Design an enzyme around this catalytic site. Structure first.
Site, PDB file in Angstrom:
ATOM      1  N   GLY A 243       0.752  -1.158   0.048  1.00 19.89           N
ATOM      2  CA  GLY A 243       0.090   0.146  -0.081  1.00 19.89           C
ATOM      3  C   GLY A 243       0.695   1.231   0.051  1.00 19.89           C
TER       4      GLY A 243
ATOM      5  CD  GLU B   4       4.470   4.883   4.418  1.00 17.46           C
ATOM      6  OE1 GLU B   4       5.492   4.422   4.858  1.00 17.46           O
ATOM      7  OE2 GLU B   4       3.410   4.502   5.007  1.00 17.46           O
TER       8      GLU B   4
HETATM    9 ZN   LIG Z   1       4.170   3.065   8.913  1.00 16.91          ZN
END
Ligand SMILES: [Zn+2]
Ligand SMILES: [Cl-]
Ligand SMILES: [Cl-]
Ligand SMILES: [Cl-]
Ligand SMILES: [Cl-]
Ligand SMILES: [Cl-]
Ligand SMILES: [Cl-]
Ligand SMILES: [Cl-]
Ligand SMILES: [Cl-]
Ligand SMILES: [Cl-]
Ligand SMILES: [Cl-]
Ligand SMILES: [Cl-]
Ligand SMILES: [Cl-]
Ligand SMILES: [Cl-]
Ligand SMILES: [Cl-]
Ligand SMILES: [Cl-]
Ligand code: NA
Length: 854
Positions: free
Chosen positions: A260, A297
């Site tokens: 993902g 991220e």
């Molecule tokens: Zn993470």
């Protein structure tokens, strides 16, 4: 084979540097690797090197530049063992691998003329022989050789320090990453990819190249993501004092990327569906998620990559800390209160449900079988709550002091959850020994609240009692460190005695002197601790908190608690309730998005969580009743606020324009739940035709489907389809919207949709839209004639022919039968037994059997 946290031993050998060369080929990719290894002082019980390596053809091996004979080492299925190695040496291995043949979605693989990796948790060992564990971190230099025509883009971690051609038809690139990292953050990508390149100037004035890479057809919808990178970078500098550490930062977006999103150092990789957004197609929610995803991220760069986890039990630190950060990032740049409601709804729904189950566990388990045991809401989402609880105890300034020290101690280190608490403790001259018990203890604590007042002496006496019951994983329990963010509200409405108090004991009373009036308490503000709270009190006490409390959360929380208790009593709507509801609706200085959340009556599935035996028809009829009353009594108000939110500005992603659009939507839903839909339908129909964005068109469509006229619903279905045939993502929403219709004919429509070319049972996203969307349609899926359960058993068997994973997921829709009354429970079991008895795949047969026997 069970692995145990108490068994941890540091690696007896360590890696300072790792130099790789990749000679890319479809069949026979060659990976030369120079490992500069040194004996680890913390573990010297033997001199055997045990490298991890899987599916590797070993062509060559040399130690200190001299070849090793077959007698001097051993190669088995999963390892490479060498005895009597020196204290300090270089080990070169040449290895060959087959990306074309890799279907495991780990190591190096190739999907659609593009090489790509995935190394978390243990996929690096499938590339070359390594110490594939996160407490071994090394400085990576990486050369990549490949064909120019086919692979002009050749990327890896860090900065491109050298480049050029070789031979008649190939080229190379060297990527150096000077900061020590574990191998699970290693990444490589090679392909023919388009790009968006841009720049960001850091706090210390350094120029950082930003580079999003994707296919020609996907790249045009990656422009908002670039903005999310800039928002992320700036927010980290501003709030956390964290500057990016390299001269370049890359993102690569590809279809069907399993993880993902992945935080590979300097080279994040995402599924295309999680970072794409066009102005025409993406709703405000879609844009917020793209931001959150990219944010999360990027934040790993420090909390994960620069300082990592020592072992995989320590995952509530690597992710929990980064999750806490991503939810703080989203809170600052959007609405704090709404984001905070959304995060709490997860803890009360899924996390509490997990801690009530046989699967219950602590955020740092003492054992595991497979890596998927760690990927849970307990570990991730309750992990962040624990980090948030330290923020609550220390305050922002002291929490940042703790982050500052955390990196000072542990930059370039793989560390434990205890190391984080120590830095947070020591930076603020404090003792968090009892707080550490949060990492070990499983289950949701229950807080019993009791209180007393003295008129004469002017003293309020609050006593609290934390009790947490035995679970499947452990029955022994203790008194945790609970922060209770609180205030007092006197009959005037002034907020007195605002502070954070602590419960470090089984039972503890707290005295407040000089209190002139018997107050109502505002407790656990912003859900300060992940606990259930037994606090019996009157509707007027809750109505006072709704009216005068500073804390936006407790206002929503107390209002949702009242509306819920009204529903369960099958009660009519109170007069004092209506006027508190009215005042919230017309509040001019309050986040309009927060208003939207507080004014939307809890959905039926949420109310059902209160009940031991879910009385489905009791719930729906009682909720329809109160929602209809509010719609009719405050009809003029809904209309007024709608048209005051229905402004004529060009579309924008400012927090005010976003909040306007959702309160506008809440208003429009109450206009449709009125006894006369004349007024609401006309407003919905115009919004439908006039909307200049998807958020408004989604809202217009959704409310047009609440119409009781068959012609009105049908035409909007067709009109919407006509416009958005060409956009798949939007067709999914078209299916989901139809699946969610609150009307007798919902099931009939969904059955007509499976035969529609817009549907395809092979495509899992369409299965979650139509079938998963129907399973979330409370009234119609749980319809007392049981045809929803029968339609679900059938579809599971049809799905099972193409995809067993998807068929198994959709089956979860039937596995809650324990929660329901005898009539629906039995129809759910019949459906499970029908699946079991039709010879399904092993996967589905096993899972269905398991919930039937539970
Ligand atoms: Zn993470
Ligand atoms: Cl090739
Ligand atoms: Cl060779
Ligand atoms: Cl030697
Ligand atoms: Cl270069
Ligand atoms: Cl530990
Ligand atoms: Cl401590
Ligand atoms: Cl009292
Ligand atoms: Cl206890
Ligand atoms: Cl406070
Ligand atoms: Cl205290
Ligand atoms: Cl507050
Ligand atoms: Cl019922
Ligand atoms: Cl309009
Ligand atoms: Cl789903
Ligand atoms: Cl199907
Ligand atoms: Na090698």
């Amino acid at each position: 084979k069970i692995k145990y946290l108490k068994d941890y031993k540091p690696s007896n050998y360590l890696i300072d540097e790792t130099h790789l060369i990749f000679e890319l080929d479809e069949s026979k990719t060659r990976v030369t690797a120079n490992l500069y290894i040194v004996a680890n002082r913390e573990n010297r019980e033997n001199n055997t090197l045990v490298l991890d390596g899987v599916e590797l053809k070993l062509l060559s091996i040399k130690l200190n530049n001299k070849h090793l004979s077959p007698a001097e080492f051993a190669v088995n299925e999963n390892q490479l063992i060498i005895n009597n190695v020196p204290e300090k040496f270089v080990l070169q291995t040449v290895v060959e691998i087959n990306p074309s043949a890799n279907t495991s979605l780990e190591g190096l693989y190739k999907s659609g003329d593009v090489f790509s990796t995935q190394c978390e948790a243990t996929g690096f060992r499938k590339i070359t022989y390594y110490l594939d564990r996160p407490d071994v971190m090394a400085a990576f230099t990486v050369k990549i050789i490949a064909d120019k025509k086919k692979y002009p883009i050749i990327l890896s971690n860090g900065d491109k320090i050298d480049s050029g051609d070789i031979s008649d038809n190939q080229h190379f690139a060297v990527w150096k990453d000077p900061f020590k990292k574990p191998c699970y953050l290693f990444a490589l990508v090679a392909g023919d990819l388009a790009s968006i390149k841009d720049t960001y100037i850091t706090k210390s004035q350094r120029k950082v190249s930003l580079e999003i890479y994707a296919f020609k057809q996907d790249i045009d919808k990656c422009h908002y993501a670039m903005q999310a990178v800039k928002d992320s970078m700036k927010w980290d500098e501003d709030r956390f004092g964290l500057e990016y550490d390299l001269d370049t930062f890359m993102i690569v977006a590809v279809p069907d990327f399993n993880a993902g999103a992945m935080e590979n150092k300097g080279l994040n990789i995402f599924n295309t569906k999680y970072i794409m957004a066009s102005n025409k197609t993406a709703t405000d929610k879609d844009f917020e998620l793209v931001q959150s995803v990219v944010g999360h991220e990027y934040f790993h760069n420090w909390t994960g990559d620069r300082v990592t986890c020592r072992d995989w039990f320590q995952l509530s630190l690597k992710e929990g800390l980064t999750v806490f950060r991503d939810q703080e990032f989203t809170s600052d740049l959007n609405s704090r209160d709404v984001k905070r409601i959304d995060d709490v709804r997860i803890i009360r729904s899924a996390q509490f449900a997990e801690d009530a189950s046989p699967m219950s566990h602590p955020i740092r388990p003492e054992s595991y079988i497979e890596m998927n045991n760690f990927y849970t809401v307990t570990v991730y989402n309750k992990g962040a709550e624990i980090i948030r609880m330290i923020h609550t105890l220390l305050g922002e300034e002291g929490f940042q002091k703790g982050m500052k020290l955390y990196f000072e101690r542990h930059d370039g280190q793989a560390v434990t959850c205890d190391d984080f608490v120590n830095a947070m403790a020591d930076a603020n001259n404090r003792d968090f020994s009892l707080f550490k018990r949060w990492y070990a203890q499983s289950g949701t604590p229950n807080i019993k609240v009791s209180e007393n007042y003295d008129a004469s002496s002017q003293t309020y006496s609050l006593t609290l009692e934390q009790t947490t019951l035995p679970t499947a994983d452990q029955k022994e329990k203790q008194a945790l460190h609970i922060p209770v963010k609180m205030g007092l509200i006197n009959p005037e409405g002034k907020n007195i005695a605002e502070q954070v108090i602590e419960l470090k004991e089984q039972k503890q009373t707290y005295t407040f002197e000089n209190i002139a009036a018997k107050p109502v308490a505002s407790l656990f503000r912003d859900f300060s601790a992940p606990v259930k709270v037994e606090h019996k009190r009157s509707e007027k006490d809750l109505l006072h908190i709704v009216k005068y409390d500073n804390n936006a959360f407790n206002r929503w929380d107390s209002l949702q608690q009242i509306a819920t208790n009204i529903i369960l009593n099958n009660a009519d709507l109170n007069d004092e309730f209506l006027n508190a509801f009215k005042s919230i609706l017309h509040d001019k200085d309050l986040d309009k998005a927060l208003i939207s959340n507080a004014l939307l009556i809890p959905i039926e599935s949420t109310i059902a969580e209160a009940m031991r035996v879910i009385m489905v028809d009791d719930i729906v009829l009682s909720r329809k009743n109160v929602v209809n009353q509010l719609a009719d009594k405050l009809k003029d108000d809904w209309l007024a606020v709608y048209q005051q939110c229905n402004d004529n500005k060009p579309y924008s992603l400012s927090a005010e324009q976003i909040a306007k659009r959702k309160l506008k939507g809440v208003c429009l839903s109450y206009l449709m739940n009125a006894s006369d839909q004349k007024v609401g339908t006309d407003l919905a129909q115009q919004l439908f035709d006039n909307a200049d964005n998807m958020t408004d068109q989604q809202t217009a469509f959704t409310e047009l489907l609440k119409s009781n006229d068959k012609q009105v619903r049908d035409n909007a279905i067709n009109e919407f389809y006509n416009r958005w045939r060409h956009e798949d993502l939007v067709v999914n929403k078209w299916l989901l919207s139809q699946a969610q219709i609150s009307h007798e004919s919902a099931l009939d429509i969904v059955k007509g949709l499976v035969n529609h070319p817009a549907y395809n049972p092979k495509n899992p996203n369409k299965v979650y839209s139509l079938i998963g969307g129907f399973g979330a349609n409370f009234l119609q899926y749980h319809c007392k004639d049981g045809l929803g359960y029968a339609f679900m058993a059938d579809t599971v068997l049809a799905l099972d022919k193409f995809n067993h994973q998807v068929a198994a997921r959709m089956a979860r829709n039937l596995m809650s039968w324990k929660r329901y009354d005898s009539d629906r429970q039995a129809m759910m079991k019949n459906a499970l037994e029908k699946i079991k008895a039709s010879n399904p795949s092993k996967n589905v047969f096993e899972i269905v059997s398991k919930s039937l026997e539970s």
